[PDB]
Every structure is written in C-alpha cells, then in structure tokens.
C-alpha cells in the first residue's frame, strides 16, 4: 500500500518499486528508496524457442531500457485532442517464459516410414489449443 509499482517486466522478471519514508520530522530530510528484484533462471537456454540452443551463462540488465514508456497518450488543449509521444528512445531478448503466452515447436515424427511433423508444447502446461 505504501509502495508504487513502476515496471513489472516478465521476460527479465524485473520489478521496481519506489517509496518515500518520513525519516525524522524535517520535510527536507526524507530519503527516496528504489528497490529492484530480479529472478534469474539457471536452466533455460539462449533461445527459448529452440531446445538445441546452448546454455546461457551471461545476463545483462540495462535499467534505462526497462523503465521506458512507449504508448501515445491523449492530451486536451481546450480546442482539440491530440496524441503525444511519451519518450523518443522508443528485438529484446526474453530470458524467462510468460504464463500469459504459449510456446510451440515443430518436430519430425517417423512411424512406418512416413514422417508427420506435429506442433509441440515446450512449456509444461501454459495455454490449451
């Protein structure tokens, strides 16, 4: 209740919260706190959509490209309504999987000579077809 969520990334599992604590009583001596929580996977591979990819042992977390806003907002100017660009900075790699997303693959299946490629489910359960 006393914390405000800024970003809730799922691919990098990054979550940032900010909070002001009323330390002492002088209004000019209150500290501003920034919390970062990162969960890293140790079993996932380089490309989450290809099981043959090698393992990944290097993780990079840029905070300038995480707390960024990229959706035009509406602004009232007393004579019209316009769309405004939040940031000008606006291929990112997905470290972990997303529950709200489904991951599938193509695999050759041989039986009596004939080969039937069928869609698989890399994720354990995720969504249903």
């Amino acid at each position: 209740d006393e914390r405000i969520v800024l970003v809730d990334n799922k691919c990098k599992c990054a979550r940032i919260t900010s909070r002001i604590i009323r330390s002492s009583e002088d209004p000019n001596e209150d500290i501003v706190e920034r919390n970062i929580r990162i969960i890293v996977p140790l079993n996932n591979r380089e490309n989450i959509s290809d099981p043959t990819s090698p393992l990944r042992t290097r993780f990079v977390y840029h905070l300038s490209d995480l707390c960024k806003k990229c959706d035009p907002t509406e602004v009232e100017l007393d004579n019209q309504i316009v769309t405004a660009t939040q940031s000008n900075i606006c291929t990112e790699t997905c470290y972990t999987y997303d529950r709200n997303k489904c991951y599938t693959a193509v695999v050759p299946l041989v039986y009596g000579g004939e080969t039937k490629m069928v869609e698989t489910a890399l994720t354990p359960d995720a969504c249903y077809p």
């Binding site: 905070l63 693959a105 009596g112 069928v118 489910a121």
Partner: protein, 232 residues
C-alpha cells in the same frame, strides 16, 4: 495353432488416420487352407485382405490380415471377432477384442534422469531414462531423437504399462536409451517425445544434455548498467 489379435493403437489413428484390425495367426503348417475374416455383432460381412509371409525356421507359417474399419466401429466399443478357419482345426478359433468404457482422461507427466555418476567412470556407455507416469488408458508412444534427427527403432527399448500401487487408475512406463561415452561427453542433446490423447496439443517433448541435469558446478555472470537512468 494360436491366434493373436491386436486392436488398433492411438498412434496409428493419429499418424495414419485409418483404423485397422489385425488378427495374426501363427503355428500354421499349410498356407493353402487358411482364411482370415472379420464378422460384426449383427453378422455384416467385413472385407479382409489376407497376406502370406515367408517360411519360419521352425516349420511354421504366419498369415497377416489387414482390414479397413471406421474409427467409430472401434471407438463405439462395438465388439469385433476375427474368424480363422483351418483344415487341421475341428472348430474355428474365435478371439474377442473390445475397448472398455468408464475411463476418465488424465494428463501424463514426463521426467528424464541423467546417467549415473559412477557409470561414466568406467568409460563404456551411458544410459538415459524417460519416465512417464500418471495416465489412463494404457496406450503410449515414446520416440527418441538426437538434435532433430529421429533415432533408429533399435537403440531404445520400451516397457508395457503397469498399474501404479499407490494411486489406482494411473499407470506408468519408461524408455531406456544407450549412448557412447564420448558422444555424451561431447555435449550432444537428446529429446523424449510422447504421444497420448490426454495432452492438449497431444504431443510433448523434453530435452536434456550434459550441462543440464545433475551438473558439477554453476557458472553465472551478471551485469547491471544504467542504474541511475530516467524512470519518470
């Protein structure tokens, strides 16, 4: 003279889309006096094609009969009987095959166990096991692969399903594959593919290698830059 009747399998339905019935007959001395036919409960005739195999070393002959039936015929549970007639048999042999009812659907679970640590020290071979448990009914199809290349039907073995003593109604089976010690030490990948009706997409796969699954050490590197950037 014994007759073996094999009901259609789920894999044959999925990958061929044509239900077939087979009642293999062995221990036959003469192939010119054999006849394989299928009759329905009401007596309607079913077209059956009879094939004659080669000569077995034990002075026996086998006849193979493949016939096309509708998926409904089998799935409806309609009881079918294969008719075999021979001059040496005073009475024709009858076999009863049907699919039981009152069976629910349970999603199976798949796990791979890496080769034992004290097996690699002998530097002879490695064994990988694919354990699938918690499913009903008891028809499964497990196929092994190596980095997208289907493996030969001879390098791996599979066992018939058996009941689970703990929870009745859920079964299990496993597939064992052997590999060269140097091949596994190189770092090649292997996959376990299982086909069953209970799965949402009806096929699942899992992947193991040397680096994943009971490893020796964990090497991680982390970089956190731009920690004082603009957030707003």
């Amino acid at each position: 003279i014994r007759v073996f009747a094999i009901p259609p399998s789920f894999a044959s339905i999925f990958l061929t889309k044509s239900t077939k019935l087979t009642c293999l007959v062995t221990d036959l001395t003469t192939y010119d006096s054999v006849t394989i036919s299928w009759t329905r409960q009401n007596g309607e005739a079913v077209k059956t094609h009879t094939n004659i195999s080669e000569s077995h070393p034990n002075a026996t002959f086998s006849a193979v009969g493949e016939a096309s039936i509708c998926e409904d015929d089998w799935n409806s549970g309609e009881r079918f009987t294969c008719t075999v007639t021979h001059t040496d048999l005073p009475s024709p042999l009858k076999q009863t095959i049907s699919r039981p009812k009152g069976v629910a659907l349970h999603r199976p679970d798949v796990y791979l166990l890496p080769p034992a640590r004290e097996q690699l020290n002998l530097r002879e071979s490695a064994t990988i096991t694919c354990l699938v448990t918690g499913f009903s009914p008891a028809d499964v199809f497990v196929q092994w692969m190596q980095r997208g290349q289907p493996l030969s039907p001879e390098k791996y073995v599979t066992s018939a399903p058996m009941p689970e003593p703990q929870a009745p109604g859920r079964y299990f089976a496993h597939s064992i594959l052997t590999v060269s010690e140097e091949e596994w030490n190189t770092g090649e990948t292997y996959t376990c593919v299982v086909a069953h009706e209970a799965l949402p997409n009806r096929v699942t796969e899992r992947t193991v290698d040397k680096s994943t699954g009971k490893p020796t050490l964990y090497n991680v590197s982390l970089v956190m830059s731009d920690t004082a950037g603009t957030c707003y």
